Amino acid sequence: ALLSFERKYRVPGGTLVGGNLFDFWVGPFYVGFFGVATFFFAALGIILIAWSAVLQGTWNPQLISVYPPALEYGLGGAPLAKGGLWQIITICATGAFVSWALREVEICRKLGIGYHIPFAFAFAILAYLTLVLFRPVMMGAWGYAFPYGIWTHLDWVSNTGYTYGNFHYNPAHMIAITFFFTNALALALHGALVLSAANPEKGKEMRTPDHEDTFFRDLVGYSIGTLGIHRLGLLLSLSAVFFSALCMIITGTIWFDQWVDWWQWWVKLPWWANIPGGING
Amino acid sequence: NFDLASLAIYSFWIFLAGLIYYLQTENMREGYPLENEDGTPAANQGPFPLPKPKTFILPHGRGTLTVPGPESEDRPIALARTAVSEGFPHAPTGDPMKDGVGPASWVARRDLPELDGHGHNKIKPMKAAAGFHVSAGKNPIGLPVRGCDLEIAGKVVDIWVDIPEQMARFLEVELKDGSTRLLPMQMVKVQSNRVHVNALSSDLFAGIPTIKSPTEVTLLEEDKICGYVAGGLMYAAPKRK
Amino acid sequence: AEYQNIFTQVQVRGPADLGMTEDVNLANRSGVGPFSTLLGWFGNAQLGPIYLGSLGVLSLFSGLMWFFTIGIWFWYQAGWNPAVFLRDLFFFSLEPPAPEYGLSFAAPLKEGGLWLIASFFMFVAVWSWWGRTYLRAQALGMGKHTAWAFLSAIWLWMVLGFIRPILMGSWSEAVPYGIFSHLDWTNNFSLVHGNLHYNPFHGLSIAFLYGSALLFAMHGATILAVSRFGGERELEQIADRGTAAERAALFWRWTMGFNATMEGIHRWAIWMAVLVTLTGGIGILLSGTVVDNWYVWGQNHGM
Ligand code: BCL
Ligand code: BCL
Ligand code: BCL
Ligand code: BCL
Ligand SMILES: CC[C@H]1c2cc3[nH]c4c(c3C)C(=O)[C@H](C(=O)OC)c4c3nc(cc4[nH]c(cc(n2)[C@@H]1C)c(C(C)=O)c4C)[C@@H](C)[C@@H]3CCC(=O)OC/C=C(\C)CCC[C@H](C)CCC[C@H](C)CCCC(C)C
Ligand SMILES: CC[C@H]1c2cc3[nH]c4c(c3C)C(=O)[C@H](C(=O)OC)c4c3nc(cc4[nH]c(cc(n2)[C@@H]1C)c(C(C)=O)c4C)[C@@H](C)[C@@H]3CCC(=O)OC/C=C(\C)CCC[C@H](C)CCC[C@H](C)CCCC(C)C
Ligand SMILES: COC(C)(C)C(=O)C/C=C(\C)CC/C=C(\C)CC/C=C(\C)CCCC/C(C)=C/CC[C@H](C)CC/C=C(\C)CCC=C(C)C
Ligand SMILES: CCCCCCCC/C=C/CCCCCCCC(=O)OC[C@@H](O)COP(=O)(O)O
Ligand SMILES: CCCCCCCC/C=C/CCCCCCCC(=O)OC[C@@H](O)COP(=O)(O)O
Ligand SMILES: CCCCCCCC/C=C\CCCCCCCC(=O)OC[C@H](O)CO
Ligand SMILES: CCCCCCCCCCCC[N+](C)(C)[O-]
Ligand SMILES: CCCCCCCCCCCC[N+](C)(C)[O-]
Ligand SMILES: CCCCCCCCCCCC[N+](C)(C)[O-]
Ligand SMILES: [Fe+3]
């Protein structure tokens, strides 16, 4: 079935591989070669998780947990029950995520639109690869990656963080959080602004974009504009994830101490480290 | 054991289910009910019901929009099925660029210009917009416009500006016959000596749909222009070598 | 070399946009400011005008007094030494009264009394700013969505500084005014309440905070991808659906099997964001008042 305006867009073309061989839809979903690839990777990864759950002895989604190899395996392959399943599932997940992005690329081409969406999704993939591939390789063991379990991967976050004291003091982490908070603030404001113009006070004609600009100028003295706010939302969210990846790729590779030590540079500068009083003298 | 935290979290999840149900139905105010590929209503509409109509009262005497409401493409669609089963492409029966299908598609929007909050045309050629000028970057006016066949299609003679947002939206390009077309600003690369347009070969510039007035552009015309130009990425692509 | 519309190629400038009037009291609106070519590469170049008015002046006065009460306290903690001030800037903290003072306003100035005074000024600054977000929309005939979304943020802040400390019995439970100290407060709060990872409202808050970045990346990228059809002109696209709105919807329908409208994506957006602090505020409010230990609580309720 189609949206009422959809048929005129369902033309042949835009695929990156396979010609017209996979150039069709299943219900609403476009397929394409990378839809087939996504299906294969995701189906196999899910099968292997089920296998791991069988070895674990539980069907409870709150208890299933696929662990990476013990650290002693270094970067080697491990037996299926002792990290190998995690390793193959990680290949399937990477395979499924990259195939998803390339499927989106084909969709962009058939619709004649920019490629901003799969480009943005690539940041999420790179953050995933930072945690399961780039950082584990740089530290020398798959076992530094996070386990695939609903609660166990949170325990991994907490165990990894507290290895470095209060992880709040990681400065790239501060920047990432600031982008995450600012992004949610801008998303609330942007959603509210558009809706407040499309759905004005009762007894009013629909507002215009001039009303949106006027509202934000009155309120804070500046309106970034309709194009600017979508640029901004994309920038904030991508910058958050970039600084997330950065804050982890350095942790345990070029920084090993309690993160609160990083700022101690500012504290113990020779020209004020020994002044009595305050906090740091 | 079922304490206040328990009551709160189960209550929130119930609220969240209702919110998602509400949000999804709100996002069915366009394009629904679903259709079969032959344009008749589809039997399977899914588990969410169609939203109840809402009304927008449009400013500047432009009328009222009610959504959802009876939908029609309001234009002919030069495509035919390639299969009796569902899920396969529909192929252009003519020239997809000229017919406005696939990535060359346009929507039958109002054949009137978008207006600003004061009821004036939102988009104007810079020569009709008192005081507007290029303030930073390469001024493209007077530069030659080059297509993806690396050949020159014309000369930039003006910039069409979104007045309220102070934004270059179109380049007005003079063709070898002395007529002009609008080129969407998002589809050009302004360079030091030229404006390069990867989407169109030079001989396809005159196919850009024309505007019926020299000082304004209607939403209908903007959709036909913007659709045609973007459609070139797919349909002028055998000329991109 | 295909243009991406992330940065503007050719900036254009005309007369300053003075804005809509509607019912705005123009007596309280400043003159227009200068244009920033720097900002013009990314968004609009025009600065100003801004609206003042009674509520804004009160908010600004009160907010600066909050800021100055903290500054004065920092200067005193630094012994008035400017170099000590810059050195320990992130380490100073205006702390609330000690627990022995309960909710009393009798804490001496140097031992919590200045914290109460700063908090008074902050409380007036935020609530008068909230009144301003409502009245600026009213004056333009607009919906009240901004004031309503802002209330969700205010809710988490009210819970942290005011509601939860009152229900806990002392101002000592409140967050201190300091860069690092409020970070230390945050870490301590989780340790004291048995791991906030296991507060389900905290998990929800994370889902919506991550989901806000997911969704704004999706929507920001989508609108840029259809800016070649005027997609960022969302109000007229709502009034009169164009090929930009249609291609945006079909990208997502073909990708994930369902899609939004130009209007309705902004309802997804506003709810994704406000649910961050809505669930967050609930989760903090229940901590210590109802649940002492989230991990233990979760184990006895199935986690
Ligand atoms: C949510 C659980 C915790 C908490 C945990 C964290 C963690 C963890 C982090 C922060 C971070 C920050 N938090 Mg905190 N934070 C809390 C509550 C608050 C409150 C409040 C009213 O309750 C405030 C004002 C702040 C303020 C701040 C900033 C210092 C910084 C970036 C915030 C941001 O992106 O805003 C989005 C809003 C905007 C961009 C608009 C402009 C905001 C301006 C910049 C706020 C200025 C505040 C203050 C007056 C600045 C003084 C600077 C000099 C000392 C003079 N937090 C609660 C108690 N917060 C990050 C950081 O960098 O810490 C050092 C960080 O890593
Ligand atoms: C006790 C724990 C420590 C701590 C330790 C850590 C550690 C350790 C890490 C972080 C990381 C992060 N922390 Mg910290 N952190 C703490 C306290 C905080 C506080 C706070 C208010 O106190 C905040 C706001 C944050 C915020 C953040 C972010 C900056 C970041 C997580 C986002 C991210 O990386 O996304 C990136 C996004 C992704 C990884 C998602 C990828 C998605 C993929 C591509 C697709 C999935 C598809 C899926 C399988 C499909 C399913 C089916 C379909 C749904 C149908 N932390 C405390 C002090 N924090 C993490 C980080 O930076 O990671 C890089 C990290 O590893
Ligand atoms: C990003 C930094 C840290 C991390 C830190 C945290 C913390 C801290 C928390 C979570 C939470 C969650 N995280 Mg985690 N998380 C990481 C990496 C991941 C990855 C991944 C492939 O990289 C995935 C799929 C998840 C998935 C999840 C969900 C179980 C949950 C809600 C997320 C959400 O809504 O996000 C935004 C995305 C959306 C709204 C879109 C929909 C996403 C859905 C919900 C994903 C379902 C995944 C499914 C259960 C697992 C795979 C399914 C396959 C078919 C087998 N995390 C890394 C290691 N994550 C929260 C929670 O409650 O955990 C119990 C929580 O408190
Ligand atoms: C060791 C630390 C603990 C922990 C302790 C806490 C505590 C404690 C809290 C959070 C909270 C949050 N945590 Mg946690 N957190 C941990 C681990 C994580 C991880 C992770 C990767 O593991 C993540 C992603 C998060 C993420 C989150 C957020 C979802 C949430 C804050 C939402 C928000 O917008 O706040 C920022 C928004 C605000 C504070 C609202 C501000 C509104 C006011 C009105 C603004 C006033 C401005 C003022 C006047 C200044 C103006 C300045 C001028 C503009 C210049 N936490 C660990 C387990 N976290 C909060 C929450 O809700 O918990 C349920 C909270 O209180
Ligand atoms: C970079 C900014 C943010 C971002 C952007 C972003 N994400 C995106 C996109 C964009 C622009 C998409 O286009 C794409 C999409 O289609 O969204 C609807 C996507 C998407 N982001 C998703 C999730 C997601 N994004 C997240 C985050 C973010 N996404 C960033 C904050 C998070 C978290 C934790 O914060 C999650 C969970 C999906 C909804 C979707 C990608 C869908 C996809 O890849 O589908 C193909 C794969 C499958 C259907 C299943 C594969 C199964 C595996 C083989 C097995 C399981 C492996 C996994 C590692 C197990 C983890 C267990 C957990 C308990 C830890
Ligand atoms: C999920 C909801 C998200 C959200 C929503 C939200 N916040 C909002 C809104 C909304 C919808 C608003 O409408 C409102 C707003 O106006 O935004 C533009 C606001 C806002 N959210 C803000 C902050 C904020 N929001 C945050 C979070 C979030 N807000 C969430 C992520 C955070 C954090 C910690 O993450 C912060 C820091 C403000 C920008 C604004 C509220 C403004 C306010 O209340 O101001 C009162 C204070 C003053 C007017 C002045 C204070 C004084 C300065 C500190 C002075 C320093 C400079 C210098 C010393 C001046 C000297 C001058 C001399 C000449 C005297
Ligand atoms: C050059 O130096 C001078 C002196 C000029 C300066 O001005 C320098 C200034 C500084 C260096 C400023 C430093 C400021 C900071 C470090 C601010 C840091 C603040 C935070 C990190 C925010 C922490 C969170 C704050 C919270 C959660 C506050 C809650 C407030 C309550 C909701 C309000 C409760 C009200 C109370 C208790 C009073 C009750 C009275 C009523 C009337 C209700
Ligand atoms: C599975 C479906 C049922 C789930 C179980 C029952 C649901 C329980 C609670 C759910 C309610 C959540 C509703 C959230 C949205 C409320 C609707 C709303 O927002 O109304 C105001 C709106 O009109 C006018 O807004 P504007 O047009 O933007 O001014
Ligand atoms: C006990 C715990 C419950 C929470 C305690 C109170 C917290 C305060 C939070 C307020 C609700 C969150 C904001 C609502 C969603 C965003 C606004 C919205 O979408 O609805 C407003 C809409 O109609 C338009 O307003 P009008 O123009 O007046 O119709
Ligand atoms: C003379 C006064 C001095 C000027 C002081 C400058 C302060 C700039 C602060 C915030 C801008 C960022 C705003 C981000 C949120 C915008 C929400 C939105 O949707 O804006 C869309 C656009 O503004 C309409 O369509
Ligand atoms: C967790 C956020 C995701 C919410 C998912 C909402 C799913 C809506 C699916 C509607 C199906 C649309 N369709 C194909 C019937 O038209
Ligand atoms: C304008 C100031 C607002 C004051 C409200 C908060 C009361 C603080 C009380 C401090 C007590 C000082 N003292 C000496 C009486 O103990
Ligand atoms: C408005 C968008 C709706 C998106 C809803 C996302 C649901 C995420 C589920 C996270 C689970 C958290 N927890 C602890 C309760 O399990
Ligand atoms: Fe938008």
Numbering used by the authors:
A (entry chain L): 1 to 281
B (entry chain H): 9 to 249
C (entry chain M): 1 to 303
Reproduce text from the manuscript describing this model.
The RC from the purple bacterium Rhodobacter sphaeroides is an integral membrane pigment–protein complex that consists of three subunits and ten cofactors. The cofactors are arranged in two membrane-spanning branches, A and B, around an axis of pseudo-twofold symmetry. Only one, the A branch, is active in photosynthetic electron transfer. The RC includes two bacteriochlorophylls (BChls), PA and PB, combined into a special pair P, two monomeric BChls BA and BB, two bacteriopheophytins (BPhe) HA and HB, two quinones and a nonheme Fe atom [Allen et al., 1987; Fig. 1(a)]. Being the primary electron donor, the BChl dimer P is a crucial component in the RC, and the redox potential of P is a critical factor in the efficient functioning of the RC.
To explore the structural consequences of the F(M197)H mutation in detail, X-ray crystal structures of the mutant RC were obtained under two different conditions: (i) cryo-conditions using a single crystal and (ii) multi-crystal crystallography at room temperature. The corresponding structures were determined to resolutions of 2.1 and 2.04 Å, respectively. The structures obtained using the different techniques are in good agreement for the positions of the atoms of the main chain. Changes in the structure of the mutant RC were mainly confined to the side chain of the M197 His residue, to the C2-acetyl group of BChl PB, a conserved water molecule and Asp L155. It is important to mention that there is a significant difference between the F(M197)H mutant structures obtained at 100 K and at room temperature. In both of these structures we observed a rotation of the acetyl group of BChl PB relative to the plane of the macrocycle that differs from that seen in the WT structure, but in the case of the room-temperature mutant there was a more pronounced rotation compared with the cooled structure. Since Phe is bulkier than His, the Phe→His substitution created no steric problems, and good structural conservation was observed throughout the bulk of the protein–cofactor system. The electron-density maps are consistent with the donation of a hydrogen bond from the imidazole group of His M197 to the C2-acetyl carbonyl group of BChl PB. As a result of the F(M197)H mutation, BChl PB finds itself connected to the extensive hydrogen-bonding network that pre-existed in wild-type RC. The involvement of His M197 in the hydrogen-bonding network also appears to be related to stabilization of the F(M197)H RC structure.
